[PDB]
Amino acid sequence: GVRTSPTGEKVTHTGQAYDDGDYRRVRFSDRQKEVNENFAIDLIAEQPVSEVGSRVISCDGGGGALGHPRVYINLDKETKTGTCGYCGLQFRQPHH
Amino acid sequence: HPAAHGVLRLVMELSGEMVRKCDPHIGLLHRGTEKLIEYKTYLQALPYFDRLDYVSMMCNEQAYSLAVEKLLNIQPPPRAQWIRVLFGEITRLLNHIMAVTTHALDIGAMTPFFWMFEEREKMFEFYERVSGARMHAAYIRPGGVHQDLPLGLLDDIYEFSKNFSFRIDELEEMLTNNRIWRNRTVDIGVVTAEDALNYGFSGVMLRGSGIQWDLRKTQPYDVYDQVEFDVPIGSRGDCYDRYLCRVEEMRQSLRIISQCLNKMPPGEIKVDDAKVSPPKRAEMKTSMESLIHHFKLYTEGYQVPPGATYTAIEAPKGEFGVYLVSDGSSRPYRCKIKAPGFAHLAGLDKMSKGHMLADVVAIIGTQDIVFGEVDR
Amino acid sequence: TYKFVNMREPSMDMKSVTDRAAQTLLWTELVRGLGMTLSYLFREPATINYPFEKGPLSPRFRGEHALRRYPSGEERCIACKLCEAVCPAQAITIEAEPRADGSRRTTRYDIDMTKCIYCGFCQEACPVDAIVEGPNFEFSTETHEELLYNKEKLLNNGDKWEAEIAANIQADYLYR
Amino acid sequence: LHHALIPHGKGGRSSVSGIVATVFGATGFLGRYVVNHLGRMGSQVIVPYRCEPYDTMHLRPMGDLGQIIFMEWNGKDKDSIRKVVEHSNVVINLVGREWETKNFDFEDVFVKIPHAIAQVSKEAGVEKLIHISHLNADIKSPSRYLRSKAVGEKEVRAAFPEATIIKPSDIFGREDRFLNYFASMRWFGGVPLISLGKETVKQPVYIVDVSKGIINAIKDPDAKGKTFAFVGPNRYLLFDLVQYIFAVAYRPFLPYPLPHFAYRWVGRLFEVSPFEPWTTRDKVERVHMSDMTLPHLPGLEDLGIQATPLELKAIEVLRRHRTYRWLTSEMEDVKPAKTVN
Amino acid sequence: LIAVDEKLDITTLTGVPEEHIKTRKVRIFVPARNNMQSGVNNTKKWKMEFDTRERWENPLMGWSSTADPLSNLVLTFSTKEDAVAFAEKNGWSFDVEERKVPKPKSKSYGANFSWNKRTRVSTK
Amino acid sequence: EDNKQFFGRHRWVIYTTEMNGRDTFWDVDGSMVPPEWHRWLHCMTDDP
Amino acid sequence: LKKTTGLVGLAVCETPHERLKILYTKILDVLGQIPKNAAYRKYTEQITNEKLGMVKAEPDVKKLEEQLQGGQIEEVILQAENELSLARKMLRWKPWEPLVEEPPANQWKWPI
Amino acid sequence: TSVKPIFSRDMNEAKRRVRELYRAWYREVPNTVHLFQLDISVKQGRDKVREMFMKNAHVTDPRVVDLLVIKGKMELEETINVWKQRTHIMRFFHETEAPRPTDFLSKFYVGHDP
Amino acid sequence: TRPTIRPRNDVVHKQLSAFGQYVAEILPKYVQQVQVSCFNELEIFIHPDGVIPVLTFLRDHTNAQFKSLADLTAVDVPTRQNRFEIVYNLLSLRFNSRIRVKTYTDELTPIESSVTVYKAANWYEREIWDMFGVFFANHPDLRRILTDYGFEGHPFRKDFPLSGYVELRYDDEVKRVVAEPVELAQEFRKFDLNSPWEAFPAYRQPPE
Amino acid sequence: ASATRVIQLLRNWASGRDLQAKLQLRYQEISKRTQPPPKLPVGPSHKLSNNYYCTRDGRREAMPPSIVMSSQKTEKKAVTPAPPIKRWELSKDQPYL
Ligand SMILES: NC(=O)C1=CN([C@@H]2O[C@H](COP(=O)(O)OP(=O)(O)OC[C@H]3O[C@@H](n4cnc5c(N)ncnc54)[C@H](OP(=O)(O)O)[C@@H]3O)[C@@H](O)[C@H]2O)C=CC1
């Protein structure tokens, strides 16, 4: 999800964009600014929430030894979903 | 200069073309390796040794690993030691190919250079297969080796070793009995045994002078006490004898390579001590102790007990030594690198007495100087 | 044990003396060297037809760097700075902060490719397989600044080379 | 000041000086010296070039990573001029040819281009404009070069009232025309001089002094809309000057008087070269013309520069013209020329 | 064996610039214990470090630049006297901080259950 | 592919005459191969 | 008897026994000027009389080389010459005297 | 406390060696200017030698003086043997460094330096 | 079996201890201390002016034929009065052994040059001088070996900055390489790696 | 290799060796670039019991060097650093080249 600054310069996923009066925009004249179009925050928000009937779940990121260190998430808070913070993956207990 | 290896300033006084004195000016490839090592950790300083004698790279790595393991009071597994010796002999083949072919190119012959450099290309392929880097592997590490061999490496090494003696024979068909090569090399740069010992020569220089001394035989390391090989011995202490010694050392290293291929044992590749060598990726991602040890080893590094050691190996260019001083921290306090070529280049002036310009070129070639290790 | 490379003496019988004299007057070893060079002339060259043919490589090859993603699209890097700590040449600069959704993610991830020694320590120390050394090696530039990669450049490299990087990691991950 | 324009460091290669300068005519003698001084300060330098990029290579090592930016430019394209002056707070104009080509005249290089640069820079909001002119810039001058210089100076002052117009006398240096042009007349037998060089007075100025004065005019806050005269410390007769040049070059000096019409015809003959001419009629007029005296205008001492005498830096230029017999001769071996002060 | 009634001064031999000899004030001290850890093994040797100088931002890549050679230079000494001697013979100015050791404290687990004193704890 | 050729010459690529927007009839780079065929051509795998 | 010693610059000696006896006698003569209680004098006198006894009891060169365990007989002669020169230098140096000076309080401490 | 002298015993012999080295450098400047093709004057070289000798005029330790004259002999024999290039000889003159300010007001204006 | 622990050699340890006692008895005037490290390395600490006698003895003695000079370097320990620690490594081929001889010196005290005992000492002592500032008295040619011509300072000293004080570039105005004060686009980021927990109790020092 | 019979004969005659026996170009005799997955061994310390790190800690067994003689603090036979190195034996495989 790329966004355009008021000076016509693309804004990166870190919010970086030179100011209007910043002289450092001269480096992009007759050239281009390297911006990655895919936003990890947007993609992980697009990812859904997995419902599992357990108080504690485990996430290793998928792939086993090719993922991240296996961690355990406690799904007791019913006001929010438990997020594995290695891969930003949300898990939840079945309500209703 | 084509014959100066790139970073040597040889200030020479010549009466006509006869050499009156040689004054080697070195330091044009001095980088401050030892100071940088002081600023690095033990794992971060390994590529420095990888880049010291950049023709015997796994040999430098093995010497550094032996020093660090001696300080740590640990022991590599037998499979790691066998892989170390196998790749040390492969590196010796690489180094001797480079030395002999560059010597012959400085004399005037280039066809053996091209042939044996194709062979060097195949050995570079072996290096890249094990490590991912063609020459600067950083593969041999204190505690063992970084990774295990792929599942075809031994067979490909066997094929290479099977087809290499013919290449050595072809190299000898152009040089050994050629009268021009004999005129260029015979009775050039003659050094007596006592002078070699006093000046501090090591390896092929001593053996050409006739000294029966080899570190792999007298002070064995890794599994060099389990392999059989012969040590070439010179008679006249000249360039021709040293060249013959290097060729025969290539053949004996082929012997050792065959023995290592047959005697490669099973087991792990590094000391089973997660406070020195990192755990496996699966253990790190499933075990809390393994994750903690991975974190600490790759951020701070393992502590080494205080003490100073001097460990030397028979690198392809002579005795390569490390004087390592540890103050108990995770970074070395001092690391002095004894390069074999330093003493040889110091002795260049004496060996060139009463000779000419081409003779001095031949003497440089037979000394086989790497200024990376000379200057550090 | 030891052996003598050159300690043999020639026999002084008339036949051997005449053979040596014929070798001296008729340049026999020189003709032999000529024959060896002629044989190599009539052999097949070992030259590959670059750039249409490439030299062999292995899954372990260390080339251009890349920052990887999870299959969901989330970045693998968690700003843990293990690669920065373990980098021998100090080629990596990392700055991070909590993201909008609270994730531990980097804001600056620079690698100076003119300072890097391509030693592979960063991908060994990474616990999430985020930073990798890809298979690419033909990325020479015309200006020095183009080799000072930043986070956007590394993410573009990862997106560009993800398939081959994933295949190589699958091939070689059981040895690690 | 913008937060990125505040000077930082110790005035070194890796420091920040707050100067963002677009240097037109940077692919030349004074251009290379000015760019070197700016990069040495640690400034941002933009180099508009119309030549082959191979001819801009000597400017690459003059600055740190990213501090030198090369962009194409036409001179007839105000779009390109704006593109290169958009992000710079200083614009320096050193564009000029000593001869005339098919596409650019003395009017084009000294009137149209400087006026376009000044007008475009005013719209873009450039804070400072430095414009290089000639000391003998007279509207009624015999030289079209100097007439165009005067007209362009007036046009630049009209377009950018806050400009700094610098008028060097005759820049001498390693890559100069002056000392090389005088020392290259060995090939054509003797040295032709109009009135034997007895009616011409010249005070050349050192290239490093000119570049330092250009740099200090940027840093000085009370030089915004001014005019400076950059001249050397000593004034020489043309005969004495050429005699000293040949003495330092260790070449035999054989002067002879050539009448003005004959010298003009000779210059006309040499200007038919499609390549860089060896001499031209305007060049002959400028060489014969005596340097003006303008005591009211400020100068190097007012900008903080002590002008370097020719007797200290002549051997840098003229040692190249010596033979092997005289290559190693020292600087003190030649008596200084007779001055007219 | 000659006798010299002079103080040791090797500033002319060390090769350090006059600016970094005269305008430098080192700090001789024992580092304070890191409050995030309970270990005290980093508070045993004296350290000598220089005064902080300017650090600015690189226009390209935004890195942290410096112009001070002695920014990263820290020396380790076994004794305050040794550190002072080194600073004096090298000619830098120095500021000495006396070592701070924790004062002895009287601890008792039985005080957590006092009959009449406030040391009794409300939780364990 | 020609497995009868010696190793290094047994696989090769004939580049296209136009990639993206650049005319590559003569100007052919080694970087014009996509990563999958790059892996196959550099022999990190036996499977195309 | 043998063609070469195998070492460059080391010539063959036709009279090894007499040369060794001469060198050992000279070494013992030099050691008589060293103080009786010197630790250097006792050890080298012991080893010299041990090696001088072997050369006076074995007339065969090969068996003498086997018994001395000092390499070849030419190497033994060279080592005897080196020992004689060292004995003369130590006579000049007089290193049996008490220690010149103890080091500072903390000079060999490590780690520090 | 008695210490091992490098040379010169007391200060007088150290001064004598300083004078000898100064003569050696003074008689070498014309040769240095001739061989290196320096654009400086012989007077400039002699003045630079005098200046480099004068910045160590405050030394009162004979051993430090002996080490200084040893290093001076080293850098003189580098100049005589043309081991040095014109690069180093002109590095002695700092011809490219900008003049550092020395007054409080200018130092305050430029930056944070003491 | 203990596969992860280095085996020890009591025979070699005892032999090295006996030979250390031997040399200490033979040379009481210079030998200050004798140590044998637990990985079987003999180390001898001597008075700085005993270098020539001790090295000549260890080279020429029949029972100590250390005919080869493996290495020669120095170690800088600023906390000591004599900061520089000269180290000699000798190899005896006849007895297949190695020995280490250590002496001490400071900035203003010369050390006798051992070029008359070993010829490698020439370049080894040249390097020691160039990198630490130690002067060797009777040296045939003592000068810089590794540093640039006219380089000021001895870089291997602990008090010498890692990047030095000057850096080189080509200046187009003067048409030559110039040396200017060091200025880094990115400063070397110093890391504090030591853990505040003691690793080896065997090396713990008294509180004093 | 792919070559004519006559050219092979000329090459063998010129060099004096049967080159086809020892070729320097690789023709399908090398290992396949794709290999089956491995399963590497674990090691000696992967036990679940009787495996304490205090009994297998190499770094903690290191000791400061033993002070054999310190100045600060019968007829003994002279000793050597080690027994003299034994004379090497000539190679039975190929004593001379
Ligand atoms: N040099 C002297 O003796 C004196 C010079 N001056 C003035 O100082 C200024 C600088 O002089 P100097 O360095 O010696 O001159 P140069 O001839 O050496 O350099 C001229 C510069 O301007 C560029 N340029 C010239 N004509 C054009 C054009 N039509 N379009 C675009 N770019 C052009 C050139 O680029 P390119 O290479 O691409 O053509 C070059 O970068 C000039 O204005 C000159 O009149 C004043 C007094 C004395």
Ligand SMILES: CN(C)C(=N)NC(=N)N
């Ligand atoms: C780098 N090495 C080892 C060389 N022999 N180099 C050379 N240019 N000959």
Ligand code: SF4
């Ligand atoms: S490969 Fe090595 S040098 Fe390069 S960034 Fe990774 S850790 Fe640093």
Ligand code: SF4
């Ligand atoms: S090691 Fe991996 S997760 Fe940690 S900072 Fe580096 S790239 Fe990110």
Ligand SMILES: [Zn+2]
């Ligand atoms: Zn997860």
